[PDB]
Amino acid sequence: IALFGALSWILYRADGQSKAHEWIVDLNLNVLQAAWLISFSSLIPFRAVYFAFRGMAPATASTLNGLKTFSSISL
């Protein structure tokens, strides 16, 4: 449903962009935006971005500091 709705939205928006008055600059704006979506796949350091987002949350920034072994031992 998501892929077919995205394709139907892309086709409907490209159709309406074709019907529009400045149609060729619409279809070239699509190229100018797809170029940046291409270049973001090449530029962004996704491992460093992943670990930066891991540092954004305190639940993933540190290890769990909780129960220690010497307290809950049972001899």
Partner 1 sequence: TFAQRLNSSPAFSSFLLKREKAESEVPPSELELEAAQKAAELEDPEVALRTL
Partner 2 sequence: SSVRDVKTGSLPTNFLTGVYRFWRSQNPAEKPHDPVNDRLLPAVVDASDKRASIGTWATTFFCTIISCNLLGLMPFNEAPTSGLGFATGLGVSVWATATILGLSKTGFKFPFIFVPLETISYTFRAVSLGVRLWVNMLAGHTLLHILTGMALALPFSLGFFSMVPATFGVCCLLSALVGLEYLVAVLQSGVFSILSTVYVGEFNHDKFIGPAAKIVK
Partner 3 sequence: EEEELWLLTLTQQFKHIQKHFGIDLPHSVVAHMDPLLIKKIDWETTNALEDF
User: Which residues would be at the binding site for partner 3 (CB under 8 A)?
Assistant: 54, 59-60, 63-64, 66-67, 69, 72-74
What is the DSSP track for the chain?
-HHHHHHHHHHHHHHHHHHSTTHHHHHHHHHHHHHHHHHHHHHS-HHHHHHHHHHHSHHHHS------TTTS---
Work out whether 70 is an interface residue with partner 1 (CB under 8 A): no
Cα 59–chain centre separation: 21
Work out whether 75 is an interface residue with partner 2 (CB under 8 A): no
Q: Which residue number, 11 or 49, has a Cβ lying nearer to partner 1?
A: 49
Q: Which residue number, 41 or 71, has a Cβ lying nearer to partner 1?
A: 41
Summarize as ranges the residues that interact with partner 2 (CB under 8 A).
Answer: 9-10, 13-14, 17, 22, 24-25, 28-37, 50, 53-54, 56-60
